[PDB]
Design a protein around this ligand. Structure first.
Ligand SMILES: Nc1ncnc2c1ncn2[C@@H]1O[C@H](COP(=O)(O)OP(=O)(O)OP(O)(O)=S)[C@@H](O)[C@H]1O
Ligand SMILES: Nc1ncnc2c1ncn2[C@@H]1O[C@H](COP(=O)(O)OP(=O)(O)OP(O)(O)=S)[C@@H](O)[C@H]1O
Ligand SMILES: Nc1ncnc2c1ncn2[C@@H]1O[C@H](COP(=O)(O)OP(=O)(O)OP(O)(O)=S)[C@@H](O)[C@H]1O
Ligand SMILES: Nc1nc2c(ncn2[C@@H]2O[C@H](COP(=O)(O)OP(=O)(O)O)[C@@H](O)[C@H]2O)c(=O)[nH]1
Ligand SMILES: [Mg+2]
Ligand SMILES: [Mg+2]
Ligand SMILES: [Mg+2]
Lengths: 354, 318, 336, 327, 122, 329
DNA sequence: TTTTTTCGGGGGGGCCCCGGGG
DNA sequence: CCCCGGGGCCCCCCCGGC
């Protein structure tokens, strides 16, 4: 069967367990959906933002929103280059990720969204108010990755055709979003689940999966080892259960992703050997990490938060490390070559620490 | 009035190789070639306004004479010089039969050859070797690094040098005598200083000064012609106190109509050629000037940014 | 017809339809309204902060100048959603500007001023490249007798100096709780919104000069109140909760942790805090308000914290990680 | 050159090199005797070094100089060689070697090799010079370090300026097309970082490794995109979340059974791949993503051949669903 | 359709007139009076000037109350004029203070009517 | 296109003849002398926006020719394609061909030539030089770094300085007489101060002021009207803000800045610029104070150019000023 | 001791198809 | 009625500073 993270995902607003206040707010928004403004759901990753968006769409249109199909749209650049975009669609809504093509997301925004917004949904999709669903929903996933030109294009398309289309954009952070677009959306904060709620969900999965559990403390450790990420907690529970023959014990170790282990080993190496040869080996390790689809910003974040965890360092060294991380995060945000900035950050950290 | 008179830069263009001032060795060598013959393929390089095209045309004329019409093929940037042109028209001209004096050959003058594609230059290689007995090639360029090395190996290099004050003064005095111009030595000194070794600019400035106010003196010369702004930028960047540098930037650059982009680019160039200051300090000043240039290119161009750049430069030079 | 706008979001529903419905932009609305009679409308450059009423103002001006019928034949609107390269500027805009003005009808001439010139509205012109803007220069001047240009932008510095010189500049002021309160109160009364005293003022203060954000917040509060269905008045705390404003208790806890000065404790507290989803911009603004408006600190501390907050805000405006920036700012303040 | 890569090994590669002055001296002396102008034996080596061993260029030099000056002696070699000096553009490796030298950055050497020379050297190859500098700035023994400065601090400063130059490069190659900033880039990416770690090479000049790494990253990203959109109907995440979260668990549900159970686990793996519309090529691509202690190359190469053969045959013999129905 | 109503003998005539100078100049300006139509066009290079002086006798009927000036683009005019048959009658219609010129194509034998309006240029 | 009364003041008052161009006495006299004796060289008018370059060249062309100059000159601008093909074909034919209408020389005006590509400029060199006998070229520019050195060397340079106060006063008087308007002396001084040497700005602001007045017949344009229509700070407001920042505590300075800004919605950028201008006159005893002021204010201006948090920006301005002036003891 | 991104312009190769001639 | 000349788009390939 499917993974436990996906097999037990709630499919309605009434099936949501944690964050009851947000559920009430979404239910309020769904009471009279014919005047729903554009929505921007922001919060930590792995909290259930997309699940809540799907639940709201189901409550607005119906269960048919969960019948999804994948199609391919063709786009042509000014240089005659051809690109293909995979679009997830339902009889009531579409889901797009314009950042898939990179800097060409503006073409998608200016053509596909314009075409959808300029066409009227004449389908007699009888709603809960006795009138057929009129507006069409488009979910722009990973809006934080959109280029500023695409957002500028979206600005007026959001306003001119509000009668025909409503946008539900999901993002993890609002800093990359431009103020004009942020002003055109209703901001919805999605807090991460607490440890108790994560433990309750994990216990529900355990009971449904007939997983032998020595004590409930293991679920507490799993929840505390995820840092609010529910997807990580569920996948970790499944991995631990499989690795222990569905017989989780109080002494069962907590599993960690391979890239996390590599980053921690790199942190230890940096803290131990502060030399140019160590910097060359760190460059090799960074190349290895980056070549396998590990985002540079993620690497920088984990490296910064792992170096600060070392108990051999003093306050001044940690302050210097965090300052260098702050500077080089902006450097990364304003550059193409990530390895250059990562190597510069490692070099500065080695200089200060030594 | 709807009938203009020819400017002195054209009315007094040297028509013989002996009337070209400056680069005595090269001019004498070209005169010897014109008197003897066996003209080799040549590439003449140098800065604008020194007499490369004039020298080439004078040499071709003195070498050919009545056969100049049928023995010279002059192509310039204003004329198409693509691969097809090189492979058809130049080849036909080289293969064309013309009966010339015993020691004369056909001439192909590719003016402004630095604006030619690498493919055309490559197609211009063998035509110069299989037809050297009938046609010779003269190129006139400003940047000599834009001509592919294979062609440079096939031609004699003539690197014209910057004209000195004496040559410009000599030619200007000759023109003054031929036009009966009332002048003051200070006026000629100012004209030479503002010309910066460009004979065309010197002659144009002299003509404008005479036609606008008459007597060629320092006051009249400087009334039309302004001092080179690169020297003003150099002076601003070499000041001791930030107050003096800001004053120079204000009363000499900002209020004279000079744009911020021009000021920053000139500062970058001058600092690049500021031999007096050490290399490291020059590099830091270049970094600051580049930051200011990037700020200006984004639309934030104001006297405040230039003042901050000057303050940072002064802090670096302290 | 009526239902088309009666079922629309409040921001679109209550968009000004005439020039007298603009709340706090009289200094330019008066000029644009007297040009209705003077018939000498100049080239306009509308710049200001987001959500101040530029697009609405220009649309109302066009409606009042031409009318419902002649509008479409006398308006060329181009925004960031259309290709606006140098080729487009040279061909399409130039061609439209070189055409004769459409013939007004008898009804239009009798009921509307029908000015003798057309209008080209380049919205979000700040995104246009410099080359296209330069190409527009002489096109603006040559055909001034038949065409007028309106460039609408947010960052005035992105418009090349020549075009800014050719266009009369109009700055749209921020809509705060002092000049835009009337419009919000009118909207609330029309929508039958029951709110306590000061709730609208709090909404406008949180909006920070954006009336669209205030209208959206009011609509969200009305939806919540209707769903709950107790018949009580909306409270300010609800507005703050719906506006992503950190509770004062958490801010005081952060301040106390910073005062403690321990790096590990601050790091742990920030890690816990970042799990709630609070935006870093709101936290930075609240910290600035708390620190700059406190008498328990000396001049040097305020001088340093102002620059620290400015640097953090500038860094966060580029799309940087919020956790790292917030932790660095808090540590630096703790070491002040 | 890439253009002539088709002629890699389909032809005999005969190499002609720059002829030495010893053989060309005889020809030059013969021409000197023939054409009635003087050329001392000590001048040929210098004249040949002027033209980078181009016999045609040397003959042209002699012909031109003989027009007016019939004597070529040690008194006039300097002027002739300076007027006819050949200027060839250095190639990536040569550019990197020259730039990372501590003699051109000295107070005496800076006059012979000015900042203009370095900036022009950058422009010889403006697409590879910054990459070569970034690749070869950590393999030198410096000789331009300030009192109290160590190698680590110098390399850190060079890396900071390299990051700034990378930002400038991003600005240059954008929609605005800001090529006027190219000179500044030259200083930020190539000249300044080299000036802080300049010295003597401690090894060989290695070619840029970022190009192949970028190609590998693009390949793996395309594979991850294909896998993600093959599983979008059964998962709630993005491609990054799929790589960081789902794949570690998918491995335990797809590869571990073979290691622990054997051939009997083929059915379970087939089932799991069927639940997420996963193909055999998708399985391989997924197994190629793991790094660190999770590398599966040796583990997969160690699996018994019978299990893999049975897995492949059973998958091919079975009918499987489709996620994207390309019409 | 008050000021100018001019029907040609056949659309082929006006077609031929237009093709005679459509590759020389781009923008033309006709000045239709009660005596006929006269147009002067200058080339971009300012080296060639084209002058057409069609007469009243070239039309089946020609009515023009007041002198009316029409500025037009030759590419667009030719493109529109290529939207008709060779056996039809073409009439030019212009109204008060023209903002566009109407080109009406009529075929009595086939009872075919086609309309085409081109916006004039200032 | 009804009449000239339905045109913007920037276009309604475009100098027709060369005698209506003010502030460029030297250039106007020189070009008029050249036209008189018939010694017109290849001209390069370099200057900032709105100084009278396009108007000057158009007036010169109309003076050389009659009212038919439009057909006797080749004027190309950025709005028209000017690639290498255009230079090779159209400009070359125009220069090498006689005049259709008259029997005089020909003028080519390459306005906004700074937007031309380097290849076109390089091709223009020999086109200019060869046909000099019967053709003359005029190039109008705002930035000189975009013009190739060869083109600059081939043309006589004339620099259009920013318009002095005197010419601006004369033109304002002419506009007031034509429009039947009254301008207060302090209003005139404020208008010239905000002009920055640009007459287009003056004309636009004067039109806005006329619009502001209830009845433009009797009412007078006071400085209050200038600041209301331009929405710019008042000198007293800038002085008060600087005094509060430099001589009061943080609370008082913050309150004063907020009150001044909220009184009439004053923008932060305008206040920063005015304070910079005011401090320019200040005689600082330490160079560090001026250096820090300039650097920090430039950084704040750059931050403002991209938006951000306005309150934090104002607090940063206050703190930077206070810290910089703390070094004056 | 080897090998990347984007607009705009320019160049150069490739057809396509109208027109005109036979 | 059929073949040939030569205008016009379409597609691709390479530069970009002093
Ligand atoms: N050595 C010279 N002696 C006398 N006049 C000169 C000399 N050089 C330039 N001139 C004058 O300036 C005018 C132009 O000289 P040119 O030959 O065009 O300079 P140029 O070096 O060919 O310009 P470039 O490099 O193609 S921009 C001549 O007609 C002369 O009147
Ligand atoms: N001056 C105003 N008066 C009344 N409502 C306003 C005003 N300004 C904005 N709004 C309200 O906010 C909504 C949007 O206003 P807009 O005209 O779109 O602002 P904007 O200037 O175009 O924002 P930007 O700079 O393009 S993001 C309007 O429909 C109004 O409901
Ligand atoms: N010397 C002047 N005298 C009178 N009015 C002037 C003067 N200069 C500019 N103006 C006014 O400003 C308007 C524009 O003048 P122009 O000279 O055409 O602008 P411009 O110099 O071409 O702008 P640039 O340099 O291309 S950005 C004129 O119509 C006049 O109304
Ligand atoms: N039991 C339970 N699980 C949830 C809930 N919300 C999210 N999840 C689980 O968390 C997983 C990831 O959620 P997702 O929305 O994709 O994360 P995000 O889009 O990055 O915020 C899902 O597979 C769900 O199983 C909830 O309310 N109750
Ligand atoms: Mg020349
Ligand atoms: Mg808008
Ligand atoms: Mg102009």
């Amino acid at each position: 069967m499917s993974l436990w993270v996906d097999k037990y995902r709630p499919k309605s607003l009434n099936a949501l367990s944690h964050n009851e206040e947000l559920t009430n707010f979404l239910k309020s928004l769904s009471d009279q959906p014919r005047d729903l403004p554009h929505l921007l759901l922001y919060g930590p990753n792995g909290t259930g933002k997309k699940t809540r968006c799907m639940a709201l769409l189901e409550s607005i249109f119906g269960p048919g929103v969960y019948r999804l199909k994948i199609d391919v749209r063709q786009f042509v650049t000014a240089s005659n280059r051809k690109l293909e975009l995979n679009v997830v669609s339902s009889p009531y809504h579409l889901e797009i990720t314009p950042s898939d093509m990179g800097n060409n997301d503006r073409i998608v925004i200016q053509e596909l969204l314009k075409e959808v917004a300029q066409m009227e949904q004449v389908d007699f999709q009888d709603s809960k108010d006795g009138l057929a669903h009129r507006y069409k929903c488009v979910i722009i996933n990973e809006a934080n990755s959109l280029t500023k030109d695409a957002q500028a294009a979206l600005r007026r398309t959001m306003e001119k055709y509000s009668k025909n289309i409503r946008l539900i954009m999901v993002c993890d952070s609002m800093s990359p979003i431009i103020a004009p677009i942020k002003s055109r959306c209703l901001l919805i904060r999605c807090p991460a689940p607490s440890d108790s709620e994560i433990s309750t969900i994990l216990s529900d999965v355990v009971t449904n999966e007939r997983i032998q559990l020595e004590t409930k403390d293991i679920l507490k450790r799993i929840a505390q080892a995820s840092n609010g990420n529910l997807r990580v907690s569920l996948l970790m529970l499944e991995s631990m259960a499989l690795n222990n023959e569905l017989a989780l014990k109080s002494s069962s170790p907590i599993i960690k992703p391979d890239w996390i282990i590599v980053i921690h080993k790199l942190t230890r190496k940096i803290v131990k050997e502060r030399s140019v040869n160590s910097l060359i080996e760190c460059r090799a390790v960074l190349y290895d990490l980056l070549a396998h689809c590990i985002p540079a910003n993620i690497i920088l974040k984990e490296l910064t938060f792992s170096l600060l965890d070392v108990e051999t360092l003093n306050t001044t060294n940690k302050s210097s490390i965090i300052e260098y991380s702050s500077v080089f995060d902006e450097r990364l945000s304003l550059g193409n070559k990530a390895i250059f900035h990562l190597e510069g950050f490692i070099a500065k950290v080695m200089c200060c620490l030594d | 009035t709807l009938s203009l008179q020819l400017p002195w830069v054209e009315k007094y263009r040297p028509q013989v190789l002996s009337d070209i001032v400056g680069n005595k060795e090269t001019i004498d060598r070209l005169q010897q070639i014109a008197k003897d013959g066996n003209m080799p393929h040549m590439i003449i390089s140098g800065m604008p306004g020194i007499g490369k095209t004039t020298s080439v045309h004078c040499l071709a004329h003195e070498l050919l004479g009545r056969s100049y019409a049928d023995g010279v093929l002059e192509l310039n940037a204003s004329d198409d010089r693509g691969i097809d042109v090189v492979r058809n028209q130049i080849k036909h001209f080289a293969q064309k039969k013309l009966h010339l004096p015993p020691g004369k050959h056909k001439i192909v003058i590719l003016d402004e050859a630095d604006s030619m594609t690498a493919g055309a230059q490559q197609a211009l290689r063998r035509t110069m070797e299989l037809y050297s007995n009938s046609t010779r090639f003269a190129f006139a360029c400003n940047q000599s690094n834009k001509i592919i090395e294979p062609l440079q190996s096939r031609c004699a290099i003539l690197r014209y040098s910057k004209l000195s004050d004496e040559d410009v003064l000599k030619r200007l005095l000759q023109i003054i005598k031929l036009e009966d111009v009332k002048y003051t030595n200070d006026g000629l000194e100012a004209i030479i200083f503002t010309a910066e070794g460009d004979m065309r600019q010197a002659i144009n400035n002299l003509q404008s000064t005479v036609a606008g106010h008459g007597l060629v003196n320092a006051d009249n010369v400087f009334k039309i012609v302004d001092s080179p702004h690169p020297l003003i930028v150099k002076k601003m960047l070499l000041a001791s106190n930030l107050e003096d540098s800001i004053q120079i930037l204000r009363t000499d650059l900002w209020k004279k109509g000079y744009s911020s982009i021009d000021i920053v680019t000139t500062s970058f160039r001058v600092t690049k050629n500021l031999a007096q200051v050490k290399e490291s300090v020059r590099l830091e000043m270049i970094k600051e000037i580049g930051l200011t240039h990037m700020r200006i290119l984004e639309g934030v161009g104001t006297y405040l940014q230039l003042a901050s750049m000057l303050a940072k430069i002064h802090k670096l030079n302290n | 017809a009526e239902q088309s706008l009666a079922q629309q979001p409040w921001v679109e529903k209550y968009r000004p339809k005439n020039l007298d419905e603009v709340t706090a932009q009289d200094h330019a609305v008066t000029v644009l309204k007297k040009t209705l009679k003077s018939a000498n409308l100049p080239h306009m450059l509308f710049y200001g902060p987001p959500g101040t009423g530029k697009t609405s103002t220009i649309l109302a001006l066009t409606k009042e100048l031409y009318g419902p019928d002649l509008m479409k034949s006398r308006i060329l609107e181009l925004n960031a959603s259309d290709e606006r390269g140098i080729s487009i500027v040279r061909e399409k805009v130039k061609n439209f500007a070189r055409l004769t003005v459409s013939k007004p009808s008898k009804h239009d001439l009798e009921n509307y001023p029908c000015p003798p010139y057309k209008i080209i509205i380049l919205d979000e012109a700040d995104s246009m490249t410099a080359d296209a803007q330069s190409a527009l220069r002489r096109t603006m001047e040559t055909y001034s007798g038949v065409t007028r240009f309106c460039l609408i932008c947010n960052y005035v510095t992105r418009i090349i100096d020549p075009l800014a010189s050719r266009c009369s500049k109009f700055r749209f002021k921020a809509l705060d709780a002092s000049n835009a309160i009337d419009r919000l109160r009118f909207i609330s009364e029309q929508e039958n919104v029951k709110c306590d005293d000061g709730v609208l003022e709090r909404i406008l203060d949180i909006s920070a000069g954006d009336l669209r954000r205030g209208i959206t917040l009011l609509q969200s509060a009305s939806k919540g109140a209707q769903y709950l269905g107790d018949g009580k008045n909306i409270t300010s705390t609800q507005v703050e909760e719906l506006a992503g404003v950190v509770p004062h208790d958490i801010l005081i806890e952060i301040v106390e942790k910073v005062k403690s000065g321990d790096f590990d404790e601050i790091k742990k507290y920030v890690n816990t805090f970042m799990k709630s989803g609070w935006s870093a911009a709101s936290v930075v603004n609240q910290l600035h308000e708390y620190y700059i408006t406190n008498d328990n600190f000396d001049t040097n501390f305020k001088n340093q914290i102002s620059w620290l907050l400015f640097t953090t805000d500038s860094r966060l405006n580029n799309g940087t990680n919020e956790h790292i920036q917030l932790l660095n700012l808090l540590v630096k303040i703790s070491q002040l | 050159l890439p253009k002539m890569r088709p002629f890699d090994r389909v032809c005999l590669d005969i190499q002609f090199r720059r002829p030495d002055a010893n053989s060309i001296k005889s020809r030059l002396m013969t021409i000197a005797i023939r054409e009635k102008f003087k050329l001392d034996p000590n001048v040929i080596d210098r004249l040949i070094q002027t033209t980078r061993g181009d016999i045609r260029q040397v003959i042209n030099l002699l012909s031109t100089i003989s027009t007016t000056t019939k004597t070529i002696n040690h008194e006039n070699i300097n002027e002739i060689s300076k007027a006819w000096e050949k200027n060839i553009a250095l190639k990536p490796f040569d550019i990197a070697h020259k730039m990372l030298d501590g003699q051109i950055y000295s107070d005496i050497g800076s006059r012979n090799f000015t900042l203009n020379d370095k900036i022009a050297l950058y422009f010889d190859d403006f697409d590879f010079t910054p990459l070569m500098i970034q690749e070869n700035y950590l393999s030198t023994r410096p000789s331009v370090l300030k009192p109290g400065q160590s190698h680590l601090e110098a390399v850190a400063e060079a890396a900071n300026c390299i990051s700034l130059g990378d930002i400038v490069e991003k600005k240059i190659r954008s929609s605005e097309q800001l090529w006027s900033l190219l000179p500044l880039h030259a200083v930020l990416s190539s000249v300044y970082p080299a000036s802080k770690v300049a010295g003597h090479m401690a090894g060989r000049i290695n070619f840029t490794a970022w190009l192949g790494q970028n190609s590998k990253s693009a390949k793996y990203y395309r594979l991850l995109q294909e896998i993600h959109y093959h599983t979008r109907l059964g998962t709630s995440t993005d491609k990054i979340g799929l790589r960081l979260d789902y794949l570690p668990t998918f491995r335990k549900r797809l590869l571990d059974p073979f290691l622990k159970q054997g051939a009997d686990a083929i059915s379970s793996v087939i089932e799991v791949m069927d639940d997420y519309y996963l193909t055999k090529e998708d399985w391989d691509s997924i197994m190629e993503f793991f790094v660190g202690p999770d590398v599966t190359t040796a583990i997969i190469k160690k699996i018994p051949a019978t299990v893999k053969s049975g897995f492949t045959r059973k998958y091919n013999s079975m009918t499987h669903p489709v996620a994207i129905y390309r019409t | 359709a008050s000021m100018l109503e001019a029907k040609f003998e056949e659309a082929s005539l006006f077609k031929r007139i237009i093709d005679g100078f459509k590759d020389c100049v781009q923008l033309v300006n006709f000045q239709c009076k009660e005596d006929g139509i006269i147009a002067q066009a200058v080339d971009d290079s300012r080296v060639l000037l084209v002058s057409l002086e069609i007469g009243v006798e070239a039309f089946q009927e020609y009515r023009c109350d007041h002198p009316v000036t029409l500025g037009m683009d030759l590419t667009s005019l030719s493109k529109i004029l290529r939207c008709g048959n060779n056996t039809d009658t073409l009439t030019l219609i212009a109204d008060n203070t023209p903002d566009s010129i109407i080109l009406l194509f009529e075929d009595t034998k086939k009872d075919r009517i086609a309309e085409y309006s081109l916006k004039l240029m200032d | 296109k009804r009449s000239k009364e339905n045109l913007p003041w920037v276009e309604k008052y475009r100098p027709e003849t060369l005698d209506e161009v003010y502030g460029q006495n030297e250039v106007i006299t020189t070009v008029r002398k050249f036209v008189d004796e018939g010694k017109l060289p290849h001209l390069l008018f370099y200057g900032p926006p709105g100084t009278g370059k396009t108007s000057t060249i158009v007036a010169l062309a109309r003076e050389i020719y009659g009212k038919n100059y439009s057909n006797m000159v080749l004027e190309l601008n950025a709005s028209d394609d000017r690639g290498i093909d255009v230079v090779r074909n159209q400009i070359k034919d125009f220069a090498s061909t006689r005049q259709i209408f008259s029997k005089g020389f020909k003028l080519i005006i390459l306005d906004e030539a700074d937007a031309m590509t380097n290849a076109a400029q390089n091709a223009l060199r020999r086109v200019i030089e060869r046909y000099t006998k019967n053709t003359r070229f005029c190039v109008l520019a705002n930035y000189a770094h975009k013009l190739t050195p060869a083109l600059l060397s081939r043309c006589t340079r004339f620099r259009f300085q920013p318009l002095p106060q005197e010419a601006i006063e004369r033109r304002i008087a002419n506009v007031l007489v034509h429009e039947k308007l009254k301008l207060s002396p302090n209003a005139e001084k404020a208008l010239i101060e905000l002009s920055n040497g640009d007459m287009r700005r003056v004309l636009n602001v004067l039109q806005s002021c006329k619009a502001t007045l209830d009845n433009p017949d009797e009412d007078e344009i006071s400085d209050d009207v200038i600041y209301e229509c331009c929405g710019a700070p008042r000198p007293s407001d800038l002085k008060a803000v600087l005094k509060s920042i430099l001589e009061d505590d943080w609370g008082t300075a913050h309150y004063t800045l907020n009150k001044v800004r909220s009184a009439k919605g004053l923008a932060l950028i305008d206040l920063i610029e005015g304070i910079v201008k005011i401090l320019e006159d200040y005689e600082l005893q330490n160079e560090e104070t001026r250096v820090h002021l300039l650097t920090k204010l430039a950084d704040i201006e750059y931050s403002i150019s991209k938006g951000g948090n306005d309150q934090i920006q104002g607090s940063a301005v206050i703190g930077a000023i206070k810290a910089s002036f703390e070094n004056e003891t």
